[PDB]
Amino acid sequence: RPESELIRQSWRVVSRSPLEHGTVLFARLFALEPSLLPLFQYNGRQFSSPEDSLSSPEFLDHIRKVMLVIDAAVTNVEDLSSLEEYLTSLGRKHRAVGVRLSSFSTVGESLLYMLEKSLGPDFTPATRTAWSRLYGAWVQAMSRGWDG
Ligand code: HEM
Ligand SMILES: [Xe]
Ligand SMILES: [Xe]
Ligand SMILES: [Xe]
Ligand SMILES: [Xe]
Ligand SMILES: [Xe]
Ligand SMILES: [Xe]
16 A cells, blocks of 8 residues: 555654644634534533633543544554444444534544644645545444444
8 A cells, every 4th residue: 555654654743742733633623613512521511612621631631542543543554444343332432422423524624634734745635535535434433333
């Protein structure tokens, strides 16, 4: 694969500082879909504004969890079949949390944004297309958590 290499190279840059980059991803997500904010309920409280999420230790740990799941996806970029069962259960957890399957396209737009801003002229259209293909495959697997 050539596009497997485009993924791996772009990711190594982002992986150097995962919380900084993850923070961009979530900041963008809340700018596109403010209704995701109430779904992060850490002992029964709701954030009022997006900037409130940024002071919460549990929210920042969730960013670290996200970036580790993406890192896994990258590691297994050839064959994502090995992650399939874990992603199905991860999707089910998110369904229980209140996330709708439609919102994972906003998530995908926010990932591409973060990549585009981070890599600048290196975010070529082959790499965008590569990441978009990977994410489409990652979402397919996750979406089994909503039944198929
Ligand atoms: C799109 C909106 C999302 C919302 C509202 C959301 C919300 C949550 C919440 C409430 C939890 C439970 C509390 C916690 O562990 O921090 C959770 C767990 C988790 N999230 Fe997310 N999340 C989303 C997206 C993602 C994405 C894109 C990933 C990874 C690519 C991710 C990875 C995880 C992981 C690994 C856990 C721990 C699950 C377990 O093993 O129990 N989440 N998420
Ligand atoms: Xe944020
Ligand atoms: Xe923010
Ligand atoms: Xe954790
Ligand atoms: Xe990471
Ligand atoms: Xe993601
Ligand atoms: Xe991904």
